[PDB]
Amino acid sequence: TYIPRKEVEVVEIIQATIIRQNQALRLRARKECWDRDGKERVTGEEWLVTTVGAYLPAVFEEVLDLVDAVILTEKTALHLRARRNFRDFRGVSRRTGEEWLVTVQDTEAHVPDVHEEVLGVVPITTLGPHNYCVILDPVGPDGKNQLGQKRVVKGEKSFFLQPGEQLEQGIQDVYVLSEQQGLLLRALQPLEEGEDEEK
Amino acid sequence: TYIPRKEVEVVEIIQATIIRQNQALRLRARKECWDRDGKERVTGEEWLVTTVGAYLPAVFEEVLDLVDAVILTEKTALHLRARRNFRDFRGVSRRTGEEWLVTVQDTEAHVPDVHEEVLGVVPITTLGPHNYCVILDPVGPDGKNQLGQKRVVKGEKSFFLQPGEQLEQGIQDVYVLSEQQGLLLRALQPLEEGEDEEK
Amino acid sequence: AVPWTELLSLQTEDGFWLILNLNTNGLHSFLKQKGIQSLGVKGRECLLDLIATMLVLQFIRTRLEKEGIMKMDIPWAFEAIKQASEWVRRTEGQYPSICPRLELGNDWDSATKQLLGLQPISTVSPLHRVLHYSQG
Amino acid sequence: AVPWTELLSLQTEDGFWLILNLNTNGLHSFLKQKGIQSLGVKGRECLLDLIATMLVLQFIRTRLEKEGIMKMDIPWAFEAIKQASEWVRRTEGQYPSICPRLELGNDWDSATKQLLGLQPISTVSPLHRVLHYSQG
Amino acid sequence: AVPWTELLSLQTEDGFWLILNLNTNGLHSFLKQKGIQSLGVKGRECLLDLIATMLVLQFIRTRLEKEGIMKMDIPWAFEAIKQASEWVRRTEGQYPSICPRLELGNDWDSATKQLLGLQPISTVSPLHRVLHYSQG
Amino acid sequence: AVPWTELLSLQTEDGFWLILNLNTNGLHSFLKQKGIQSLGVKGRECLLDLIATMLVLQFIRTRLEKEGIMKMDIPWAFEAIKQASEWVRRTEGQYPSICPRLELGNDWDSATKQLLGLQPISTVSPLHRVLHYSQG
16 A cells, blocks of 8 residues: 655656567657666667566656567568568577578577567468479579579478579479470570480 | 453455365466465466365455366377466476376376366277378477478377367278279389289 | 246247246355356256256146145146156266255255255255345 | 438448447547557557447447347348457457456446446445536 | 547548547647747657557547447448548658657657547646637 | 648749738848848848748648648648758758857757747747737
8 A cells, every 4th residue: 555745746647558468568768768678768769578477667758558578489480671680599690671581490489579570470381292392583592582583493392482482384294205205395505404414 | 252352443244165086276476475375476467276175264365166087088088288387286397388188007197287277078989990190280200290291100009189280071981902903003103002012 | 927938939949848936046156156167167067957857847836735745756837847857867877966955955855845944944954145145 | 210321321431340339539548547558559440440449339328228138149220230259259368358458347237337327336436537527 | 429420521632631529729839839940840740640640549548438339450441441441541650659659648648638628627638729719 | 721722833943932910111120230241131031031941841840730740841822842951951051050149049949939929938038029019
């Protein structure tokens, strides 16, 4: 209970918020301050709190909204644009405007940070033993797309289309030929193909 | 009987709940507390109690609803999605979003935990001696589906379609042939088959 | 000569239950004062449906005894009486002795007959503000 | 004989909720005085929609109990009652004990029935300026 | 029965906002006295459009709560309410705590409801010359 | 219900600006007494056109705020408002702080609103002989 005082005025009766499992709470600052973790925050700066249970807002922390995590099954991944320079949960440095994917081998559930952006949930592209596909603008070893080029993927393989990549016409089935059947097919560049021992 | 007091106010007259066999009671906390088992509980956190008889709620335990167990016959199994990181009754660690099956060889009856989800009761797929089937996306040794691949099951065998697996066209009957009958059938990949001694 | 087809109109889609002529708001106030919120919202509605179904059964049984005639199972309502008995004989076992602990009667005969208002109730019982509050 | 088709007109596009006959502006003033702005604008609207949906559910349940009949799931409104129950039984778990802390009642039965105005409220409770402010 | 099609006529070409029944000139004088010229002309107009949009949203929400029903997202105005919510939930983050510092309320519920005039305001607040200056 | 097509008739051939209802001759006398001839004839006309354009913009903005609704950019005048904003946001940068130094207000909101006559002006300011000289 509270005993009153003449020079102390009760402004309002604030209420706590209940954070269950796999959620977080978005709350900006109202003033230059320090949060419950002990970090300086400027006015308007938003952040997240990930404690489970009843969470009581401070006097300078406008609670905005509850953020619920995204469950990563083996057939889905998460496409995320960075909003500024930060370091995410794995501990890699990001740049502004950069896009990437988050899979099950990172976390089984991911709560979207305020420095990130949910662009969409990418379903897996899987190829049967009788299937192949061509990838428009593939990602090289440098993490950047080769614009204009292509890459042919064949066999039993399941993968995600990384940000920038695209299929040319979709999942395509491989040509299978008997001895009564043949294919006429023209080159476009000087090429080599060692199917048998000779080239 | 209760003798009253000036500084003590009776709030309400609460009533107990009757838990018969093969049931449990779901009840969240109202405040940071300790339950009857002696475990700390945060606000909003739900759990279960599995004692049989009259159960009296505490002052901070909102009784939600009664949960009744699911009876596992030999022709049915239980498909369960995990809701968070926990350890179930057998003592294996689960991850969020993970699915699995519970059969009679685990328990003859299973009460669905609050950290789980009843996705459906899976009937058994049994094959006669004259039957075979093809399984789309089978589960390998790693517990994960091979997406795109297939697996042929033949003979007298009864099994459950694990989460992810599927039959291609159903329970199919095997080709049976006399000497007046033959089959024309084409390969799709280089293959080997040693039916007789030669290959 | 109660409206019978209008009683057939009030059969619920699961098999449970102004024509009943009973103070319902005072009954809700009485059951709230006896502390029915400690059973969950689901348990509270499951108990109110049981109490209402047994009240309608005691009303119809008093009507049939005035004509002369868990054993309720006329051709025009045999299906509704049958599914009501099949509902009640399953849902009663979850709540043993809920009639003394809510202070309505010893068993369901005593509770539903003293709430039905066809028998006088003794003065030491708190059941006076359910049959005499509607007389204002 | 409340307007029922006009209640069907007020079904929202997500599945939640003058015909209700309740002082809404005084109720907003009461809930503002109890400090509902500390939940965000989204949390405030999510709590007001829950309170309004449970108030409409308690109104319709009092109407059905006067006829005699989280368990709400007539053919003309079974879909709306079903989607309302599916909304409420998901959105209630985010706000445990929001009825005592906003000072409306112990549980949702007590809170929605004392706000519905069909039961008297004791004098030590601050719930007097929501049912008697509209009587001027 | 406010004119609704005339409210649809006043939808701006970007997605923001006498029918509103509010002293607008006294409100401009109040916001000028609180010092809104220190934000630029662009910032002043961007804040006035936010205040007017939230005032219209609180007016329509009071209208919908009297019927019974950052979460505003009827078929005849779903697009306008949707684009208004998409405008407000982007433009509010530029101005945190602009309702206490302009002395209108704690949050947007308090500010827009005390400016809407449907709730009484305490005497220690300077919000008396916006609802009582129009009563002359 | 001001004449709007007659406002469209008064759009100049470059894109700047009795219907305005303001003492123009007393305003010219006030601006001459404040010493506007020290800017050249070209600078004087360029400043009078800016002041008149911002006065018409504040008049139309007060009209639109009474209906409820450097950011001015209805279908019947979107082109004139657009070219007026494109003129003003280029020509304002030549004259910084021309509203205090001519003694009209702090910024363009204060200056054009106190010259528009919809807000009272304090007694220590010399702005009394522009709104009360026309009342004879």
